[PDB]
């Protein structure tokens, strides 16, 4: 698997392969992993298929009772402390690296990590999923401050990417989502929309 | 626990142009007793002696080993062993045996075959030779036997003193561990004359 | 298990072994000889492992009867116990180790009586007596309360009754019957079995 | 924990005249990963204690939360007490001991830092509820590698001032780097004093020599 | 996870006919290096009592502060001190207590009887506790046992006057058996500690051993 | 264990504690862990004692015949390879770490071993369960092209880092200087720590020992 | 251990020796085997120290909740009954504590033993520990309800003596107890050495 | 193991049992009752694991004391058998489990003499005869090859004898002695032990 | 470690970490994982230091006798197959992870790998070691055919920085290596000289 998200002035863009496999046996090859927690929250779920699905289920439940009480649009900093509140509660029962990114009217895009074991930290790009560990050199070559939105995407579509062609878990289609104030705008890349990279060939 | 299978405790201490060592007497099996009399000192020359503490087989296997090679030596080179030759000899014989040893640890006690200076040694199951000026123990009892040495040893000790140094050292220590003792031998080793004693020892 | 006891005297050496041999829960013979004549004055007694008994007791037995061919004299009970301890403590290292535990008695015209305990790793000890087996938990107290140096070969026999009498009030195997030979300057002499 | 995820390597502290100083560099590793380069291993408790942790980062930063409610909460009392440096220290030794117990221990190493009466705390707690003072302290391969150095100097000068203290800090962090494959160049330094708790940047041993 | 770890340490304790002396080192230790060279293991219980605790530091020190806690409800209850053997007895209890999860410590009580006269109870880690005249304890028991039993128990030596322990003799003997220990263990040898116990009260010396 | 090594302006200074320990009882108290290798090469050695002690010795004989053969000096990276090619054929069995130390006529060489067989070639280095100790004052202290005095003095204070913070290591500090003129064995060149003073008399005097039999053997 | 217990005409003799070991390490020589739960009760200890010091002390308390609430004292058997329920509670958990309970009761002299195994049984001549085995054989070759105080006294020591030869675990000073109407007496304390020198 | 046997005969039910209480090699008790009277006309015989035979047997000897108490009537021989089959197969998933081997013999005025086989996993089986232990290997043969149904209580006893000198010649135990016991119309019945 | 060796029209580029590891341990900080077989061909080693090291020498021994018999300069596919040959055959007994990368008047620059198992194959450009994970994406999306030895010093000056930055396991000086028929051109780069990319804020 393979999730990223990267902060922009004004939001932030997330992306994930589409991959659940079973062994070597690819049960669904149109994952959607990018999941609307709330309007402009968003989580990126890697690790177990039942446990990211039912923790983002449980902070959905939690997050929109939280919203309706309080009745004002509810922070993407309370959305990352629930998610690592019962990450970190059932660290030993649950395999679920989530990254939470989104918009707010206080502090604008921002990306949370909540890796396995419950930690969170706010970062300016998260990268998730057993392809991450092939794109590290890739994301913090390219990263530069001050990318737009359309930068950010174009970012994110080449990282995933190259993930997907050296991971065997990690394949499919890339799904791309960019959050700000006026709202979520969602787009999947296929085939030839995929970004391609020529291999060395001797 | 393979060196407690059948327990042993020996001692070798120096003094003034005399040497001293002392075995605990007792052959078991575990926690039964089966002689009190077994030997774990044996000569190796006039004034040279060798004190094997392990696996009993292995005490006795060393012992025969060591005396093949020795008479062999003597014979050949036509003059006694020097206690540091016997000590790198029973080094070559446990080490020949590095991957798959003897369960027995050696102490030398003996007087240079011409000088007659005092010799004392420790070998382990793999052949490590450490040469010490004092005192040198090896067996069940052997923390037992460093704290009574450390504290009862003193330099250019008599033949006499030797004696109630090495023997008060081992009945103490012998008394704290449970598969050592049934008796106390000791060997007072000087130029003219090998005075050997039993104790009067707890045989519990 | 299989029950070993040997008595040293001022003149003789007086043994005895059980007489049983068991598959699993059940006795198979009850007239079973678990003493092997080496030589005309040394005993092996032998018990262990199943196969590795006779295995070990006929070779030194056979080696011991080569030697008196072929040097027109015997081994001595000491030469032969430490012929023994030789091959079964070069066997114990070796990928074929018997598991055996041996109690060998003789008399040497000159020595006189001899009784040698060996356990399965080759550890000789000599003793005026000794035991092998679970019973000897039983009986080896008996023996260290009544055993004097100069018994006669008549108190040795009731010692050796006090003590199979003990195995069958106390022990938990039905040890009936026991093999009774003693070794002096005339030779190895059977006497009566011990049965109960 | 059971098992440990994303962990901090060592954290070191010495005790100068007139406060403590304590070290640790901004890096969490997932297993030779260094995945997290700039989370703070330090944290401020009150304006006399300071916590510097090694191990789990989320056990390290669950404490935060329990130890930082905890300041808050005696805090709205408003009445002239406050939790010092060895009172933190006890607590968090009773909070190991009892994890450890149930057999959950909090995979954490921690160095507590503090300056109150005129007095400089520096105490250690590992997960099992092993706890000390010393005048310097190191955690994980800070044991083996800065300890030895830190204390040679507190044997030969046994009081340091603030100077000596930080300098000696730094010449550790930087054999760190040299000798430990899971620290990163980037570190923290915090200081209490009788001003409180001060925590220096992202400073850095650029004064590494490599004459390959 | 493994909940315990031998931190090292040794402790003696000698009983005379107006004096108890408890002693010990001050090494901590974790597998092959120390966590300080300052941490003695004798604890003041009362006026007339002191007790000593080596093997998992964390045990230690949770069973002194619950034999603390303790000592305090009976004065509570009772309206009085506790006695030395009143103290061994609670102790044996609250040792069993955990006999399925036991405390990793070994415990020698030192202190005066009901008459004035020294009183050393020496413990299992699980209970099991006995009335001695002298016992060690720790990494260097059986180095320091010996010789106690040979010169304060006269033992296997003949013709020798068996007179009544001065405090001087004991003094010397508690320091000459812990230098022996110090050159043949490598877990005991920082500091010693010894605490002696009269009428008067606890007074408590400290002796340099050698540093590894 | 603490052994150390680092290469100075004129040649090689090895250093290396005293101690040998059986379990967490100390056995020796004075055990020599510099080894002679030619005149020219010594080696410290940590690890199983008994293979340090035979390895090295083994290596000893060899160049022996081997500068008997060849009529000139041994060189540095001949007993390395031997070392080094024993050890892998032994895979870790026989652990013999080691600091390989000596000047032959290409200059003074310092090298590494580890018990599998693998050789580094450094201007410093530490080995034994004093390793760290010993690393941390060389990353602190050393200086390329040093003297002897100065050089000595760092190989010491590395030794003594692991003496008081390793429970392995302790007692004695030996150093062995090779020069290109000259080689010293400083055998017990620095005493640090030593046993307390004894306060009471525990001496048994002649008739405490009761004796059960006594048998005097002459010899002549 | 060895401890050993036998019902003979004038009573019951109990004895046991002194050694408690920390694997192949004596931790002590003079400890107390024998527990005196009544004036008249009492119990014998091999297995766990710990495990056996602390459930005869609760077997002693419970004991004497009974003399008070029921104004009379315990019998033998539900002495026994009592440790045996007890320690049967905490079975598998690794409890090791083998004893004898002596005593008079209304039925006259009685001897039970209890084990941490569930064993509970009533007999004349017991013998536990790892010098069991050693003391059975010569308490059997000698033993007679019509044995004389001073024989039976005799023959207590000597198996105990004979045991601490053969055992490591066992050694240190007999202890010996003799039950009768009147109460429990401690009758001696004799050291294996000094008896090593008598029966030599 | 220990070894407990039951005949029944047309009017009466037979049952032996060993009297040896062992402890590792040793026999520390030789007149142990492995028998508990559960009624006047029910018996009930015990072995197994040690504390879980008195234990259980205890419990169900006053359960079935109480219901006399209660309801003034005995509880059947088949009722017995059938209580105690619930007791052990409800323990038998739980965290304390019995493991006890067990046959309980008994006489009804309406079915006559009635002998049941349980097991520790808590199958009951009613059987003409039955054995529990190593020996039951040995001695079900001989009572498959001389049982008839209608077995005089004097012809019984002599079957009894067979197989428990059957015992005494292939069995590796010593179990000497077996207490015998009779249940019939006039109650149960201690007959002489049979010793060897 | 991260080993990495690139082929460019004329000769071949080698890379190393220089960081060996007991553990956590950095037992050599210093260390040349770049060893030259012949005059003109290398081997970039990575895994065990003894296995690596023992093979190493045997080929070069084995390699020298066969050129002093063929009186002609190695090929590069020799060496490579002589380091296959031991690696296949104590594919059980050896870890060791090789890049055999060198010029040949013949075939030009040719970087051939041999991983782990014996397998042999020429390729373009050769990654290796625990840093090479991190580091597939960048050189995937950053290597060009028709580069030339500065930029393919730079290629991998870069894509080792990224490597030794996230690899616990490498780091150290990047030492570098250029080999073609005029001969070898040996680098080391060290503190500011190795490439640096910059940190995120948030
Ligand atoms: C779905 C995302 C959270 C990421 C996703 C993609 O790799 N994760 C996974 O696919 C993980 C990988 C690993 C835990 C074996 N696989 C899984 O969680 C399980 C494997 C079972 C043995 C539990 N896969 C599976 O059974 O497929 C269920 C499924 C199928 C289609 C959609 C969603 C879920
Ligand atoms: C020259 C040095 C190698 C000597 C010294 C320094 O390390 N040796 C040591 O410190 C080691 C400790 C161990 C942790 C390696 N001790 C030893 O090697 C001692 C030798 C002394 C008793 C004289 N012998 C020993 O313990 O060997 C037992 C053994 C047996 C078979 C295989 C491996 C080990
Ligand atoms: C119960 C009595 C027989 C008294 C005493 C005399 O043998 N018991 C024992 O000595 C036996 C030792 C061995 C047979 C297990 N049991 C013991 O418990 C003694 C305890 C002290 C006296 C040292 N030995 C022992 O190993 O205990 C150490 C220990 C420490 C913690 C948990 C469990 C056990
Ligand atoms: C092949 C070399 C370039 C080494 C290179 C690996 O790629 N760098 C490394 O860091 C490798 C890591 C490897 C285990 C994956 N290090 C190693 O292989 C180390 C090197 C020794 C000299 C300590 N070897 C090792 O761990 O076992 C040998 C050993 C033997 C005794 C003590 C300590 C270590």
Redesign the interface.
């Known amino acids: 698997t393979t999730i990223m998200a990267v ?1 922009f002035d004004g939001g932030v863009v997330l992306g994930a392969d589409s991959r659940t496999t079973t062994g070597s046996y690819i049960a669904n090859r149109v994952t959607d992993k990018l999941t609307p927690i709330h309007d402009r929250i968003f989580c990126c779920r890697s690790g177990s298929a039942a446990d990211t699905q039912a923790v983002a289920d449980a902070v959905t439940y939690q997050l929109g009772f939280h919203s309706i009480e309080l009745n004002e649009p509810p922070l993407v900093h309370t959305a990352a402390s629930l998610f ?1 509140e019962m990450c ?1 509660r059932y ?2 029962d649950l395999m679920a690296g989530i990254i939470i990114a989104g918009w707010d009217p206080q502090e604008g895009g921002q ?1 949370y ?1 909540v ?11 998260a990268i998730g999923g057993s392809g991450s ?6 994301v ?4 530069r ?1 001050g990318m737009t939105k359309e930068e950010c995407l174009q970012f994110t579509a ?2 995933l990417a ?2 997907m ?2 991971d065997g878990s990690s394949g499919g289609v890339i799904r791309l989502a960019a959050i700000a104030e006026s709202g979520v705008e969602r787009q999947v890349l296929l085939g030839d929309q995929i970004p391609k ?6 | 626990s393979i060196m407690s299978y059948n327990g042993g405790a020996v001692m070798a201490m120096k003094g003034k142009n005399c040497v001293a060592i002392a075995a605990d007497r007792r052959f078991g099996i575990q926690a039964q007793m089966v002689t009190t009399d077994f030997q774990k000192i044996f000569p190796m020359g006039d004034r040279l002696y060798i004190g094997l503490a392990g696996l009993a087989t292995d005490v006795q296997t060393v012992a025969q080993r060591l005396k093949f090679r020795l008479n062999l030596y003597e014979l050949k080179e036509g003059r006694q062993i020097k206690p540091y030759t016997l000590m790198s000899m029973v080094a070559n014989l446990l080490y020949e045996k590095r991957f798959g040893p003897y369960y027995t640890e050696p102490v030398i006690a003996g007087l240079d075959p011409k000088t007659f200076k005092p010799f004392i040694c420790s070998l382990d199951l793999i052949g490590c030779p450490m040469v010490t000026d004092d005192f040198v123990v090896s067996g069940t009892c052997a923390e037992q036997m460093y704290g009574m040495c450390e504290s009862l040893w003193e330099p250019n000790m008599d033949p006499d003193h030797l004696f109630e140094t090495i023997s008060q050292a081992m009945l103490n220590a012998v008394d704290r561990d449970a598969v050592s003792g049934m008796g106390v031998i000791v060997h007072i080793i000087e130029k003219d004359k090998i005075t050997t004693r039993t104790l009067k020892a707890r045989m519990d | 298990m299989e029950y070993l006891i040997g008595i040293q005297g001022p003149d003789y050496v007086l043994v005895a072994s059980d007489r049983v041999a068991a598959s699993n829960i059940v006795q198979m013979k009850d007239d079973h000889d678990k003493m092997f004549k080496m030589s005309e004055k040394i005993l092996l007694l032998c018990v262990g492992e199943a196969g590795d008994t006779v295995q070990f007791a006929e070779y030194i037995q056979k080696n011991v009867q080569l030697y008196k061919m072929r040097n027109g004299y015997e081994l001595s009970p000491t030469a032969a116990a430490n012929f023994t301890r030789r091959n079964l403590a070069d066997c114990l290292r070796s990928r074929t180790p018997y598991h055996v535990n041996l109690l060998l008695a003789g008399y040497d015209e000159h020595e006189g009586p001899a009784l040698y305990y060996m356990d399965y790793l080759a550890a000789l000890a000599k003793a005026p007596f000794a035991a092998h087996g679970y019973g000897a938990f039983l009986t080896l107290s008996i023996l260290d309360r009544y055993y004097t140096p100069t018994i006669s070969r008549e108190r040795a026999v009731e010692l050796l009754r006090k003590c199979l009498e003990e195995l069958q009030k106390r022990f938990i195997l039905n040890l009936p019957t026991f093999s009774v030979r003693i070794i002096d300057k005339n030779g190895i002499h059977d006497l009566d079995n011990i049965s109960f | ?6 962990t901090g390597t060592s954290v070191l502290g010495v005790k100068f005249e007139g406060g403590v100083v304590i070290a640790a560099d901004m890096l ?1 590793s ?1 297993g030779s ?1 260094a ?2 380069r700039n ?1 703070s291993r330090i944290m401020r408790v009150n304006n006399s204690t300071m916590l510097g942790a090694s191990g ?3 056990d390290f ?2 404490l935060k939360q329990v130890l930082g409610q905890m300041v808050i909460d005696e805090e709205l009392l408003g009445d002239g007490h406050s939790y010092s440096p060895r009172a933190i220290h006890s607590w968090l030794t009773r909070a190991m001991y009892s994890r450890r117990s149930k057999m959950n221990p909090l995979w954490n190493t921690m160095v507590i830092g503090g300056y109150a009466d005129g007095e400089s705390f520096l105490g250690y707690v590992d997960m099992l509820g092993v706890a000390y003072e010393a005048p310097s302290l190191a955690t994980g391969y800070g044991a083996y590698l800065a300890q030895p150095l830190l204390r040679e100097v507190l044997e030969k000068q046994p009081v340091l001032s603030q100077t000596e203290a930080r300098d000696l800090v730094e010449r550790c962090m930087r054999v760190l780097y040299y000798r430990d494959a899971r620290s990163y160049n980037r570190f923290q330094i915090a200081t209490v004093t009788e001003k409180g708790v001060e925590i220096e940047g992202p400073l850095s041993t650029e004064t590494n020599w490599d004459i390959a | 996870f493994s909940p315990y770890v031998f931190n090292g340490g040794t402790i003696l304790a000698i009983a005379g006919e107006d004096f108890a002396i408890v002693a010990s080192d001050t090494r901590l230790s974790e597998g092959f290096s120390i966590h300080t060279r300052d941490s003695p293991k004798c604890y003041k219980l009362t006026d007339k009592t002191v007790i000593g605790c080596s093997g998992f530091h964390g045990d230690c020190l949770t069973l002194t502060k619950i034999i603390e806690a303790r000592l305090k409800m009976y004065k509570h209850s009772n309206n009085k001190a506790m006695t030395t053997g009143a103290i061994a007895a609670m102790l044996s209890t609250i040792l069993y207590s955990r006999r399925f999860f036991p405390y990793y410590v070994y415990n020698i009580i030192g202190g005066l009887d009901e008459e004035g006269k020294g009183a050393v109870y020496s413990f299992d880690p699980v209970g099991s506790y006995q009335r001695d005249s002298f016992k060690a304890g720790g990494s260097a028991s059986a180095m320091l046992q010996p010789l106690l039993d040979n010169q304060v128990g006269f033992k296997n030596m003949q013709n020798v006057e068996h007179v009544p322990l001065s405090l001087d003799r004991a003094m010397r003997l508690v320091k000459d058996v812990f230098i022996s220990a110090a050159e043949r263990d490598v877990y005991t040898g920082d500091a010693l500690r010894i605490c002696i116990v009269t009428k008067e009260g606890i007074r408590e010396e400290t002796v340099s051993l050698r540093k590894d | 264990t603490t052994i150390a090594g680092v290469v100075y302006k004129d040649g090689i200074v090895l250093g290396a504690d005293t101690r040998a320990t059986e379990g967490m009882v100390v056995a020796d108290k004075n055990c020599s862990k510099i080894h002679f290798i030619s005149p020219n090469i010594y080696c410290c050695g940590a690890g199983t004692a008994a293979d340090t002690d035979m390895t090295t010795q083994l290596i000893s004989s060899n160049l022996e015949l081997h500068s008997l053969s060849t009529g000139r000096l041994p060189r540095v990276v001949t007993a390395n390879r031997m070392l080094k090619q024993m050890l892998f054929r032994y895979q870790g069995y026989i652990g013999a770490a080691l600091v390989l130390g000596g000047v032959d006529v290409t200059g003074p060489h310092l090298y590494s071993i580890y018990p599998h067989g693998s050789t580094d070639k450094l201007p410093y280095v530490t080995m034994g369960s004093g390793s760290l100790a010993a690393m941390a004052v060389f990353e602190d202290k050393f200086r390329p092209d040093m003297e002897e005095e100065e050089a000595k003095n760092l190989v010491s204070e590395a030794i003594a880092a692991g003496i008081f913070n390793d429970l392995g290591s302790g007692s004695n500090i030996d150093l062995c200087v090779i020069s290109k003129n000259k080689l010293d064995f400083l055998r017990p060149y620095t005493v640090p720590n030593k046993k307390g003073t004894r306060l009471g008399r525990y001496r048994c005097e002649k008739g405490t020992t009761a004796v059960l039999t006594e048998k005097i053997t002459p010899l002549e | 251990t060895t401890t050993l217990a036998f019902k003979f005409r004038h009573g019951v003799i109990v004895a046991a020796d002194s050694r408690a070991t920390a694997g192949a390490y004596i931790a002590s020589q003079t400890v107390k085997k024998v527990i005196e739960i009544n004036p008249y009760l009492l119990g014998t200890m091999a297995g766990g120290a710990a495990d056996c010091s602390f459930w005869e002390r609760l077997l002693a308390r419970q004991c004497r909740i009974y003399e008070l609430r029921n104004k009379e004292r315990i019998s033998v058997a539900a002495a026994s009954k009592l440790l045996a329920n007890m320690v049967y509670q905490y079975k598998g958990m690794g409890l090791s504590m083998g004893t004898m309970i002596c005593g008079w009761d209304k039925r006259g002299p009685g001897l039970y033993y209890v084990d941490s195994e569930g064993n509970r049984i009533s007999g004349a001549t017991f013998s536990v520990g790892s010098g069991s085995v050693y003391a059975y054989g010569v308490m059997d070759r000698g033993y007679s309800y019509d044995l004389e105080v001073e024989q039976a006294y005799d023959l207590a020591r000597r198996a105990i003596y004979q045991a601490t030869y053969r055992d490591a675990y066992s050694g240190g000073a007999v202890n010996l107890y003799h039950v009768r109407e009147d109460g429990w007496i401690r009758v001696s304390s004799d050291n294996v050495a000094d008896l090593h020198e008598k029966y030599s």
Chains 1, 9 share one sequence.
Do not use: H
């Open positions: 902060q690592k970190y660290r030993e990306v990590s890796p396995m074991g419950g930690m969170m930290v706010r970062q300016s790009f560990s092939y794109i590290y050199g890739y913090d070559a390219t990263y401050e080449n990282a190259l993930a062609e050296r990279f020529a291999v060395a060939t001797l | 924990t059971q098992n440990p995820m994303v969490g997932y990963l995945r997290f989370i789990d980062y989320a930063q669950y």
